[PDB]
């Protein structure tokens, strides 16, 4: 490029910067092409072009001006890239602001979508504010290849689409530009199918939706509604390995954490709306907005000390009682809690407080509701036509045709969408087995095998691998968490190693072992010592997340206290011992709202949590317990640097079944960060109990779950204990401990202590 062209850009004299900025073809070779990407990045000193799907990165060079950059790249196609931009000591990664010169679908967009590889399809499908032929308006586009006709109906034409019939492009996608309407427009698509039947559909790629049970889509100017402040969070994430950090997740169902009064409006970020009543049977209650949740949930979490919030599915869903797991509006955060920019504000405020956001994401199925994706164009479009692979009959839902390119693309791009537009830090996928098996919840003679005779759902395995390949290329540093309940192998291993590409898997066997164990009367736990220790046998086959989830405190299973035997003191003590063990056992941690304050009743998705319990000392003490435990977890490297290496854990003794006592070490990089953990899972105290330790010296009692401030009896070692030169458990030194009842101790060598 010339200096004159540069200067035109720098001084805002150029007639159309898209002519120069963005990605432009320079030449075509025999087997490749030469491209330039240009960027004007005021205040940046350096920039790179990332091609995350090829795992490449090329520096950009300043050209004529220190803030004007170019990068020449040879490759057959340059569809997928990001700009990494350094301003002083800080780096951000963004999509190219000049990527798309027009709001309409190009030939190239259509080709990539036809092939299943348009990672940014949601920039063109759906509804977008823009300009065509000189006039501002909204561009609508929808995939419906077998429809006979499609029209845009909405507020702007009183729901009569005769003058807003769409144009079909390439036998596949319908479009229309509507001048002089903007964000806030309410609409649907009116489709006529091959039989002549006329019906109404919400926008599959819609960005916002009326409040259930209404279903019209609403136009959002998604790139001009919110100003983020989380660049430093996003930089640290991208440059860190979350597997080597503390990860303690507070799992939350937004609709049922806390309710407000329906006698007032729902406040929004700089605005308000009518209240959304929780149900017809509880009409005095409304949901809190994303905005109110930012102001209330986030400081609550921060003070408790969790590193992450995990949300039950926030994608738009018609029935509260599905908990969000039957989604019909995959590209919009539920309108129960306000607008897209209110959820953006929630995430930005998490990041300001140093808290990450994990979304439960639901690619496995979708419900039959007629506004949604089902039978979209008068054919089996999103779902597979064969009910043996396209329906989950026991659930009454439909299963995506993962082999069909445009369906694969809908979902792959949807996962990316949440990380792009809403800056989330992770996803969690429930019931991964439901996708992986062609015989899932199907009787003999009612499913068919794959092309090799097996039960593996090949197309679904390929989709999962593609999702996780792409996610980590575009957004390194994120969490991709699976729950897979059939011992499918290598769930949390890289795709190139034959895995499914997740980086963490819920340890469901661990969860069952613990909750079954703790539910046993303590005298009988001697017959089930193996529940305590067994999960360490397979532990290194995956990267495990230790999750005690929402699913465990519903349907007659009781809340945590209710699972435990004994009198009220012992029930609390059991909860503290279980969770101290959980936080000291190798693996990352997840627990569900209400567990941290000892709610007695099961989680009820139709009400809110029993916050009044925190008026009382025992609940307050348990909450302080969790606060201190989260703090300890973040403060002790041996609890998080080596979760997934043999070095990070070793049993000291796990053979005393007759007293339900086990002990173990956790280690990190520094040998002085080693921790000694001792568990007593009966109510019998022990005044002298010997445990082998690896070094001489004074072992401080760093944590004790029987402390009086946690509701315990305050038994313990009065600060700590000198090791004896007295070999035990095959170690040269040993501690003569007092073990409190139904309690866990954590001890740590203070090598500077005065003898
Ligand atoms: Mg009509
Ligand atoms: Mg399940
Ligand atoms: Mg057993
Ligand atoms: Mg309530």
XYZ file of C-alpha atoms and ligand atoms in Angstrom:
759
model
C 0.000 0.000 0.000
C 1.097 3.691 -0.629
C 1.764 6.296 2.081
C -1.018 8.415 0.528
C -3.573 5.606 1.098
C -2.239 5.140 4.629
C -2.610 8.757 5.451
C -6.103 8.855 4.031
C -6.979 6.175 6.608
C -5.079 7.764 9.500
C -6.698 11.145 8.974
C -10.163 9.920 8.152
C -10.180 11.083 4.549
C -10.632 7.724 2.900
C -13.969 7.218 1.136
C -14.321 3.561 2.240
C -11.737 1.939 4.531
C -13.074 -1.536 3.566
C -11.261 -1.105 0.271
C -7.929 -1.252 2.112
C -8.541 -2.709 5.587
C -9.378 -6.316 6.251
C -8.436 -9.278 4.104
C -7.746 -8.749 0.416
C -6.620 -11.146 -2.297
C -3.303 -10.189 -3.874
C -2.711 -13.128 -6.300
C -3.583 -16.701 -7.165
C -0.888 -19.269 -7.587
C -1.190 -22.807 -8.831
C -1.987 -24.409 -5.465
C -2.439 -21.398 -3.206
C -3.216 -17.723 -2.958
C -1.491 -14.692 -1.577
C -3.531 -12.463 0.697
C -2.935 -9.324 2.648
C -4.588 -8.404 5.891
C -4.436 -4.774 6.874
C -5.392 -3.080 10.105
C -5.395 0.376 11.579
C -4.822 0.007 15.307
C -4.389 3.358 16.983
C -2.143 3.079 20.005
C -1.002 -0.467 19.200
C 2.778 -1.009 18.887
C 2.566 -4.495 17.447
C 0.011 -6.930 15.898
C -0.183 -10.469 14.612
C -2.606 -12.412 12.370
C -3.632 -15.698 14.099
C -4.964 -18.511 11.875
C -6.166 -20.591 14.843
C -7.556 -23.437 12.724
C -4.114 -23.988 11.080
C -2.354 -23.302 14.406
C -0.309 -20.458 12.769
C 0.530 -16.959 13.804
C 2.233 -14.313 11.555
C 3.525 -10.943 12.708
C 2.099 -7.849 11.115
C 4.495 -5.046 10.090
C 3.880 -1.342 10.488
C 3.711 0.227 7.061
C 4.076 4.061 6.646
C 2.763 4.810 10.087
C 3.458 3.022 13.410
C -0.259 2.168 13.883
C -1.031 0.990 10.366
C -0.282 -2.728 9.907
C -0.012 -5.262 7.112
C 0.539 -8.952 6.872
C 1.068 -10.988 3.772
C 0.043 -14.626 3.995
C -0.029 -17.421 1.454
C -2.661 -20.038 1.897
C -5.475 -21.454 -0.335
C -8.230 -19.790 1.662
C -8.181 -17.255 4.438
C -11.630 -17.606 5.987
C -10.705 -17.951 9.609
C -8.427 -15.557 11.475
C -8.047 -13.259 14.407
C -5.959 -10.160 15.168
C -3.766 -10.106 18.230
C -3.104 -6.460 19.140
C -0.435 -5.224 21.648
C -0.911 -1.757 23.286
C 1.838 -1.096 25.792
C 2.240 -4.126 28.076
C -1.256 -5.599 27.120
C -2.433 -7.954 24.344
C -6.042 -8.536 23.121
C -7.300 -11.009 20.505
C -10.263 -9.941 18.339
C -11.981 -10.687 15.139
C -11.007 -8.315 12.296
C -13.297 -5.281 12.438
C -13.185 -5.048 8.646
C -13.970 -8.705 8.011
C -17.387 -8.195 6.396
C -17.949 -5.383 4.008
C -21.664 -6.059 3.510
C -24.570 -7.257 5.626
C -25.842 -9.678 2.880
C -24.746 -13.174 2.279
C -21.909 -13.441 -0.242
C -21.132 -16.378 -2.444
C -18.349 -17.287 -0.219
C -20.597 -17.211 2.923
C -23.027 -19.593 1.152
C -20.349 -21.954 0.022
C -18.746 -22.181 3.495
C -22.149 -22.780 5.163
C -22.976 -25.480 2.521
C -19.852 -27.206 3.563
C -20.492 -26.889 7.281
C -17.474 -24.585 7.891
C -18.768 -21.081 8.336
C -17.551 -20.374 11.888
C -19.128 -16.921 11.897
C -22.448 -17.762 10.124
C -24.399 -15.919 12.759
C -23.011 -12.667 11.292
C -25.167 -13.212 8.211
C -28.026 -15.599 9.217
C -30.589 -14.170 11.621
C -31.397 -10.464 11.778
C -28.728 -7.750 11.489
C -28.874 -3.964 11.410
C -27.181 -2.625 8.324
C -27.300 -0.689 5.045
C -28.177 -1.875 1.584
C -28.617 0.425 -1.410
C -27.922 3.418 0.670
C -30.696 2.977 3.228
C -30.446 1.750 6.825
C -32.671 -1.192 7.928
C -32.496 -4.906 8.858
C -31.255 -7.746 6.841
C -33.003 -11.093 7.579
C -31.841 -14.466 6.370
C -32.922 -18.049 7.117
C -31.941 -21.541 5.993
C -35.094 -23.388 4.711
C -34.174 -25.150 1.529
C -37.530 -27.039 1.068
C -39.945 -24.278 1.841
C -42.259 -23.125 -0.951
C -42.252 -19.600 0.411
C -41.095 -17.572 3.451
C -42.126 -14.140 4.545
C -41.094 -11.825 7.358
C -43.983 -11.049 9.701
C -43.734 -8.606 12.542
C -44.794 -5.516 14.337
C -43.688 -3.353 11.377
C -46.272 -4.882 8.974
C -49.013 -5.955 11.491
C -48.115 -9.524 11.024
C -48.999 -9.529 7.408
C -46.035 -10.671 5.262
C -47.459 -10.222 1.722
C -45.244 -7.207 0.947
C -42.182 -8.822 2.737
C -41.840 -12.105 0.879
C -38.234 -13.240 1.008
C -35.959 -14.178 -1.877
C -34.547 -17.537 -2.146
C -30.751 -17.780 -2.785
C -28.983 -20.770 -4.150
C -31.965 -23.123 -3.534
C -31.162 -22.901 0.191
C -31.452 -19.611 2.053
C -34.130 -16.971 2.128
C -33.319 -13.306 2.533
C -34.814 -9.971 2.840
C -33.826 -6.436 3.519
C -36.335 -4.215 5.271
C -35.555 -0.502 5.260
C -36.130 1.870 8.122
C -36.622 -0.634 10.943
C -34.038 -1.285 13.609
C -33.241 -2.961 16.867
C -36.312 -3.811 18.933
C -38.297 -5.029 15.975
C -40.452 -8.019 16.823
C -40.782 -10.712 14.112
C -41.155 -14.260 12.984
C -40.729 -16.062 9.770
C -43.969 -17.256 8.000
C -43.204 -20.398 6.096
C -45.198 -22.243 3.545
C -44.061 -25.856 3.014
C -44.279 -28.208 0.026
C -47.820 -29.234 0.980
C -48.995 -25.583 1.065
C -49.263 -25.567 4.827
C -48.532 -22.167 6.394
C -46.980 -21.811 9.891
C -44.856 -19.435 12.007
C -41.289 -19.934 13.269
C -39.081 -18.058 15.693
C -35.607 -17.151 14.135
C -33.211 -20.028 14.707
C -30.350 -17.464 14.759
C -32.313 -14.916 16.689
C -30.398 -12.845 19.227
C -33.319 -11.995 21.591
C -36.871 -13.262 22.089
C -40.086 -12.206 23.812
C -40.676 -13.643 27.283
C -41.974 -17.123 27.429
C -44.587 -18.189 26.615
C -44.519 -15.647 23.783
C -41.968 -16.623 21.046
C -41.360 -13.771 18.604
C -37.707 -12.963 17.887
C -36.430 -9.513 18.480
C -33.713 -7.636 16.437
C -30.562 -6.857 18.349
C -27.724 -4.540 17.342
C -25.464 -6.943 19.123
C -22.137 -5.187 18.489
C -23.325 -1.774 19.595
C -25.127 -2.365 22.897
C -22.366 -2.915 25.457
C -18.893 -1.719 26.258
C -16.657 -4.418 27.795
C -13.895 -3.814 30.360
C -12.478 -7.305 30.677
C -9.382 -7.194 28.445
C -7.011 -7.988 31.218
C -9.084 -11.026 32.359
C -9.197 -12.310 28.784
C -5.459 -11.887 28.354
C -4.632 -13.805 31.487
C -7.040 -16.543 30.528
C -5.575 -16.943 27.065
C -2.020 -17.127 28.546
C -2.816 -19.600 31.366
C -3.476 -23.265 31.774
C -6.691 -23.579 33.846
C -5.778 -27.220 34.561
C -2.911 -25.967 36.772
C -5.047 -23.488 38.688
C -7.567 -23.717 41.462
C -11.068 -24.268 39.862
C -13.917 -24.170 42.468
C -17.249 -23.771 40.706
C -20.515 -22.558 42.282
C -23.220 -24.106 40.035
C -26.308 -21.877 39.747
C -29.802 -21.997 38.180
C -30.488 -18.371 37.476
C -34.263 -18.581 37.681
C -34.267 -20.168 41.203
C -31.357 -18.646 43.155
C -33.172 -15.572 44.412
C -36.553 -14.061 43.465
C -37.823 -10.468 43.821
C -41.239 -8.870 44.198
C -43.544 -8.793 41.248
C -45.096 -5.570 42.557
C -42.262 -3.599 40.976
C -40.519 -3.357 37.650
C -37.360 -5.453 36.874
C -34.476 -3.046 36.804
C -32.071 -3.345 33.862
C -28.701 -1.817 33.051
C -29.741 1.839 32.615
C -33.460 0.902 32.133
C -36.344 -1.289 33.374
C -38.956 -3.661 32.184
C -42.159 -5.256 33.327
C -41.653 -8.021 35.875
C -41.499 -11.615 34.786
C -43.664 -13.561 37.196
C -42.108 -16.825 38.202
C -45.300 -18.811 37.898
C -49.102 -18.530 38.038
C -49.022 -20.335 41.313
C -46.567 -17.908 42.999
C -47.657 -14.680 41.462
C -46.130 -12.344 43.959
C -42.631 -13.405 42.907
C -40.596 -12.298 39.828
C -37.199 -13.279 38.442
C -34.209 -11.118 39.075
C -32.595 -9.565 35.991
C -29.079 -10.307 34.749
C -28.373 -6.829 35.999
C -29.700 -7.522 39.558
C -27.851 -10.870 39.520
C -24.619 -9.034 38.708
C -25.180 -6.744 41.691
C -26.141 -9.594 44.063
C -24.879 -12.999 42.964
C -21.421 -11.856 41.949
C -20.401 -10.240 45.315
C -21.940 -13.263 47.118
C -19.755 -15.597 45.100
C -16.654 -13.445 45.424
C -17.029 -13.347 49.203
C -17.546 -17.115 49.344
C -14.315 -17.528 47.389
C -15.351 -19.573 44.337
C -13.296 -19.084 41.145
C -16.200 -19.770 38.720
C -19.946 -19.640 38.348
C -21.459 -22.421 36.230
C -24.930 -21.681 34.842
C -27.652 -24.115 34.037
C -28.640 -23.497 30.428
C -29.348 -19.848 29.763
C -30.157 -20.286 26.070
C -33.807 -19.433 25.370
C -36.109 -22.195 26.489
C -39.996 -22.254 26.666
C -40.562 -24.229 29.945
C -39.097 -23.335 33.344
C -39.489 -26.921 34.441
C -36.921 -28.226 31.883
C -34.343 -26.299 33.988
C -33.092 -24.997 30.599
C -32.240 -28.372 29.117
C -34.896 -28.180 26.307
C -33.775 -25.256 24.290
C -35.510 -23.603 21.388
C -33.569 -20.303 20.931
C -29.925 -21.384 20.782
C -28.545 -17.906 19.915
C -30.172 -15.842 22.584
C -29.851 -15.626 26.361
C -33.216 -16.158 27.949
C -35.408 -13.083 28.148
C -36.675 -14.150 31.599
C -33.854 -12.089 33.038
C -33.730 -9.138 30.656
C -31.773 -8.288 27.508
C -28.554 -9.397 25.841
C -26.635 -6.413 27.146
C -27.703 -7.194 30.714
C -26.131 -10.638 30.435
C -23.057 -9.042 28.847
C -22.861 -6.786 31.875
C -23.084 -9.848 34.165
C -20.177 -11.555 32.489
C -18.058 -8.319 32.382
C -18.696 -7.834 36.095
C -17.695 -11.456 36.850
C -14.419 -10.799 35.038
C -13.856 -7.528 36.932
C -14.174 -9.525 40.138
C -11.847 -12.237 38.933
C -14.644 -14.860 38.465
C -15.066 -17.033 35.349
C -18.378 -18.031 33.737
C -19.093 -21.573 32.506
C -22.284 -22.206 30.491
C -24.156 -25.462 30.378
C -24.564 -25.912 26.657
C -27.138 -28.300 25.153
C -26.234 -29.663 21.715
C -27.757 -33.147 22.262
C -31.391 -32.497 21.401
C -34.174 -30.087 21.118
C -37.893 -30.209 21.963
C -40.807 -30.495 19.526
C -42.347 -27.134 20.105
C -43.795 -25.736 16.829
C -42.106 -22.289 17.162
C -38.661 -24.032 17.353
C -36.429 -25.969 15.059
C -38.661 -29.040 14.540
C -39.607 -30.021 11.003
C -38.490 -26.548 10.170
C -39.169 -26.202 6.437
C -41.756 -29.103 6.161
C -38.969 -31.657 6.198
C -36.771 -33.191 8.849
C -34.230 -30.300 8.515
C -32.468 -30.024 11.905
C -33.399 -33.484 13.140
C -32.539 -36.720 11.363
C -35.529 -38.203 9.469
C -35.042 -41.711 10.868
C -36.580 -41.797 14.440
C -34.194 -44.522 15.405
C -31.342 -41.926 15.440
C -33.407 -38.672 15.246
C -35.643 -38.942 18.322
C -35.052 -39.600 21.959
C -38.442 -41.291 22.505
C -38.177 -41.631 26.295
C -37.669 -37.895 26.438
C -40.088 -36.799 23.786
C -37.339 -34.800 21.977
C -35.573 -34.670 18.667
C -31.867 -35.302 17.947
C -29.844 -33.093 15.599
C -28.601 -34.602 12.339
C -24.965 -34.115 13.203
C -23.830 -35.367 9.764
C -25.763 -32.743 7.892
C -23.392 -29.840 7.134
C -25.663 -26.885 7.872
C -26.893 -28.499 11.126
C -23.308 -29.224 12.264
C -22.594 -25.578 11.355
C -25.576 -24.259 13.366
C -24.174 -25.906 16.490
C -20.394 -25.409 15.985
C -20.891 -21.742 15.297
C -23.284 -21.571 18.271
C -20.639 -22.759 20.703
C -18.189 -20.209 19.324
C -20.897 -17.516 19.492
C -21.089 -17.593 23.256
C -17.289 -17.187 23.643
C -17.299 -14.412 20.923
C -20.218 -12.259 21.830
C -20.572 -12.990 25.484
C -16.947 -13.620 26.543
C -17.671 -16.815 28.496
C -14.863 -18.892 29.939
C -16.101 -22.407 29.524
C -18.912 -24.789 28.592
C -20.232 -27.925 30.230
C -22.136 -30.586 28.182
C -24.684 -32.825 30.146
C -25.436 -36.463 29.055
C -22.701 -36.780 26.463
C -23.612 -40.505 26.202
C -26.909 -39.428 24.623
C -24.975 -38.267 21.593
C -22.258 -40.864 21.495
C -24.497 -44.097 21.227
C -26.796 -45.049 18.449
C -28.549 -47.426 20.899
C -29.055 -44.820 23.662
C -32.264 -45.619 25.602
C -33.344 -47.837 22.676
C -34.470 -51.478 22.866
C -33.293 -54.276 20.616
C -34.659 -54.047 17.088
C -35.318 -50.324 17.531
C -31.924 -48.878 16.557
C -29.436 -49.602 13.799
C -25.717 -50.024 13.956
C -23.116 -47.757 12.392
C -21.544 -48.687 9.006
C -18.943 -50.904 10.848
C -21.482 -52.865 12.893
C -20.877 -50.912 16.076
C -22.996 -48.857 18.419
C -20.824 -45.630 18.145
C -22.652 -42.676 16.714
C -19.931 -41.746 14.230
C -21.329 -38.394 13.102
C -21.825 -37.231 16.731
C -18.312 -38.266 17.712
C -16.971 -36.292 14.760
C -19.049 -33.207 15.729
C -17.920 -33.292 19.374
C -14.284 -33.510 18.271
C -14.713 -30.607 15.874
C -16.377 -28.437 18.579
C -13.574 -29.063 20.986
C -10.810 -28.705 18.358
C -12.204 -25.295 17.337
C -12.955 -24.044 20.785
C -9.473 -24.473 22.089
C -7.869 -23.076 18.813
C -9.968 -19.913 18.917
C -10.132 -19.489 22.760
C -7.177 -21.145 24.399
C -7.366 -21.248 28.066
C -11.148 -22.110 28.322
C -12.784 -25.015 30.134
C -14.643 -27.693 28.170
C -16.294 -30.028 30.662
C -18.232 -33.272 29.890
C -20.516 -35.483 31.906
C -20.259 -38.938 30.269
C -21.754 -41.801 32.224
C -20.704 -44.985 30.278
C -16.921 -45.217 30.623
C -16.285 -44.030 27.131
C -12.542 -43.694 27.014
C -10.355 -40.572 26.579
C -13.216 -38.068 27.033
C -10.882 -35.405 28.419
C -7.922 -36.111 26.142
C -6.873 -34.250 22.990
C -8.494 -35.182 19.754
C -5.090 -35.962 18.156
C -4.664 -38.553 20.880
C -7.948 -40.234 20.001
C -9.930 -38.301 22.679
C -13.145 -36.309 22.459
C -11.224 -33.138 23.207
C -12.743 -31.994 26.524
C -10.303 -30.865 29.229
C -12.315 -32.010 32.207
C -14.839 -34.811 32.890
C -17.207 -35.039 35.909
C -16.261 -37.972 38.071
C -19.762 -39.442 38.422
C -18.358 -42.700 40.028
C -16.644 -40.544 42.648
C -19.836 -38.641 43.276
C -21.825 -41.878 43.782
C -19.158 -43.418 45.965
C -19.028 -40.412 48.258
C -22.729 -39.766 48.606
C -23.430 -43.472 49.107
C -20.656 -43.620 51.695
C -21.752 -40.696 53.691
C -25.323 -41.858 53.716
C -24.148 -45.022 55.619
C -24.366 -45.097 59.382
C -20.849 -44.449 60.598
C -20.424 -47.849 62.394
C -21.107 -49.492 59.030
C -18.644 -47.454 57.001
C -15.974 -50.015 57.930
C -17.553 -52.372 55.368
C -17.231 -49.732 52.690
C -13.749 -48.251 52.955
C -13.409 -49.049 49.307
C -15.894 -46.105 48.528
C -13.295 -43.728 49.906
C -10.354 -45.051 47.951
C -11.547 -46.746 44.788
C -11.852 -43.712 42.517
C -8.063 -43.154 42.764
C -7.610 -46.379 40.831
C -8.881 -44.999 37.498
C -8.312 -41.283 38.374
C -5.372 -40.695 36.015
C -7.271 -41.879 32.931
C -9.061 -38.526 32.654
C -8.773 -35.011 34.034
C -11.541 -35.186 36.640
C -13.809 -32.598 37.968
C -15.372 -33.598 41.382
C -18.948 -32.399 41.011
C -21.804 -32.571 43.550
C -24.465 -31.141 41.282
C -28.118 -29.939 41.141
C -29.070 -33.400 39.936
C -28.174 -34.887 43.357
C -30.460 -32.726 45.497
C -33.782 -33.250 43.733
C -36.426 -36.031 43.283
C -36.448 -37.572 46.682
C -32.696 -37.606 47.072
C -32.585 -34.943 49.825
C -30.324 -31.958 50.157
C -26.881 -32.615 51.630
C -27.766 -32.457 55.328
C -30.702 -34.773 54.818
C -28.507 -37.422 53.283
C -26.440 -37.725 56.408
C -27.078 -40.078 59.384
C -27.226 -39.049 63.010
C -28.347 -36.094 65.092
C -28.182 -32.530 63.819
C -24.575 -32.031 65.025
C -23.398 -35.112 63.226
C -25.289 -34.268 60.002
C -23.366 -30.966 59.829
C -20.143 -32.656 60.734
C -20.621 -35.189 57.957
C -21.214 -32.387 55.433
C -17.933 -30.629 56.574
C -15.966 -33.846 56.409
C -17.271 -34.800 53.021
C -16.505 -31.367 51.528
C -13.075 -31.048 53.188
C -12.278 -34.401 51.656
C -13.633 -33.333 48.326
C -11.506 -30.137 48.336
C -8.321 -32.117 49.296
C -8.842 -35.016 46.959
C -7.293 -34.557 43.626
C -9.460 -32.934 40.932
C -11.232 -29.608 40.301
C -14.369 -28.817 42.356
C -18.111 -28.079 41.609
C -20.941 -27.665 44.061
C -24.528 -26.418 43.617
C -26.226 -23.487 45.195
C -27.826 -24.169 48.637
C -25.138 -26.706 49.541
C -22.891 -23.961 50.993
C -25.381 -22.940 53.753
C -27.094 -26.220 54.553
C -30.470 -25.820 53.023
C -32.630 -28.613 54.345
C -35.119 -28.895 51.547
C -34.407 -30.186 48.043
C -33.838 -27.687 45.256
C -37.104 -26.554 43.820
C -36.805 -24.878 40.433
C -40.200 -23.151 40.938
C -39.153 -21.205 44.078
C -35.951 -19.621 45.312
C -33.461 -20.794 47.856
C -34.290 -20.725 51.622
C -32.191 -17.665 52.401
C -33.979 -17.158 55.768
C -31.859 -20.065 57.121
C -28.864 -17.741 57.165
C -30.506 -15.934 60.120
C -29.319 -18.902 62.230
C -25.949 -19.808 63.589
C -25.545 -23.345 62.260
C -26.127 -22.233 58.644
C -23.884 -19.228 59.109
C -21.149 -21.444 60.463
C -21.379 -23.824 57.537
C -21.207 -20.906 55.120
C -18.079 -19.596 56.926
C -16.661 -23.075 56.625
C -17.039 -22.977 52.868
C -15.707 -19.428 52.696
C -12.532 -20.511 54.590
C -12.197 -23.674 52.599
C -12.332 -21.817 49.261
C -9.717 -19.419 50.621
C -7.431 -22.276 51.638
C -7.869 -23.901 48.247
C -6.673 -20.752 46.471
C -3.812 -20.195 48.926
C -2.294 -23.741 48.816
C -0.500 -24.760 45.671
C -0.436 -28.458 46.635
C -4.339 -28.369 46.317
C -4.215 -27.382 42.607
C -0.874 -27.457 40.702
C -0.535 -31.155 40.383
C -4.120 -32.496 40.332
C -3.412 -34.489 37.315
C 0.188 -35.876 37.931
C 1.227 -38.757 40.163
C 3.449 -36.363 42.047
C 0.446 -34.496 43.393
C -0.945 -37.268 45.522
C 0.067 -40.304 47.603
C -1.793 -42.275 50.180
C -0.003 -42.411 53.594
C -2.408 -45.082 55.017
C -5.831 -46.093 53.781
C -6.048 -49.556 55.516
C -7.607 -48.647 58.824
C -11.213 -49.535 57.685
C -12.180 -50.517 61.108
C -11.934 -46.910 62.242
C -12.834 -45.284 58.839
C -9.590 -43.265 58.832
C -7.536 -42.423 55.750
C -4.589 -40.102 55.129
C -2.638 -38.802 52.246
C -0.167 -36.230 50.888
C -0.680 -33.524 48.317
C 2.357 -31.966 46.714
C 3.287 -29.128 44.469
C 6.622 -27.865 42.833
C 8.012 -26.807 46.219
C 8.477 -29.636 48.697
C 7.716 -27.282 51.511
C 4.171 -26.781 50.070
C 3.367 -30.483 50.792
C 0.270 -31.123 52.753
C -0.708 -33.857 55.099
C -4.405 -34.659 55.070
C -6.060 -36.834 57.678
C -9.695 -37.935 57.595
C -11.834 -39.390 60.410
C -15.164 -40.557 59.115
C -16.750 -41.717 62.394
C -17.844 -39.755 65.379
C -15.218 -41.415 67.586
C -12.433 -39.052 68.482
C -8.902 -40.389 68.693
C -6.529 -38.761 71.290
C -3.454 -40.365 69.868
C -3.421 -41.537 66.241
C -0.111 -41.984 64.500
C 0.494 -40.876 60.935
C 3.736 -41.100 59.027
C 5.128 -37.887 57.535
C 8.115 -37.434 55.192
C 10.212 -34.788 57.092
C 11.162 -33.848 60.614
C 9.827 -30.589 61.877
C 6.746 -28.816 63.288
C 3.468 -29.562 61.313
C 1.099 -26.664 61.679
C -2.632 -27.592 61.843
C -3.523 -25.461 58.853
C -7.231 -26.512 58.741
C -9.522 -28.438 60.985
C -13.182 -29.018 60.032
C -14.111 -29.526 63.660
C -13.202 -25.927 64.581
C -15.840 -24.243 66.682
C -16.311 -21.436 64.178
C -17.567 -24.086 61.692
C -19.950 -25.633 64.254
C -17.595 -28.365 65.376
C -16.576 -29.456 68.904
C -13.195 -27.674 68.689
C -11.091 -30.721 69.159
C -7.671 -30.860 67.574
C -3.918 -30.333 68.042
C -3.772 -26.809 69.436
C -1.916 -25.275 66.526
C 0.065 -28.222 65.331
C 2.469 -30.965 66.254
C 6.213 -31.846 66.321
C 7.019 -34.928 64.332
C 8.753 -37.753 66.164
C 11.649 -39.728 64.865
C 9.549 -42.818 64.840
C 9.100 -44.605 61.576
C 5.424 -45.257 60.615
C 3.513 -46.000 57.372
C 6.917 -46.493 55.804
C 8.146 -43.015 56.434
C 10.972 -42.036 58.724
C 8.984 -39.520 60.829
C 5.476 -39.564 62.288
C 2.856 -37.426 64.002
C 0.925 -38.392 67.065
C -2.344 -36.676 66.316
C -5.584 -35.972 68.054
C -8.343 -36.737 65.402
C -11.530 -34.848 65.959
C -14.882 -36.564 65.348
C -16.328 -36.692 61.808
C -13.586 -34.360 60.602
C -10.687 -33.694 58.370
C -7.336 -32.119 59.288
C -4.903 -30.465 56.918
C -1.319 -30.074 58.224
C 1.664 -28.383 56.696
C 5.421 -28.400 57.713
C 6.560 -24.912 58.975
C 10.300 -25.337 58.345
C 11.091 -22.033 60.071
C 9.638 -22.979 63.462
C 11.827 -22.524 66.657
C 12.564 -25.823 68.678
Mg -51.313 -13.391 6.725
Mg -28.046 -37.194 33.512
Mg -19.948 -51.229 47.365
Mg -38.392 -18.194 48.674
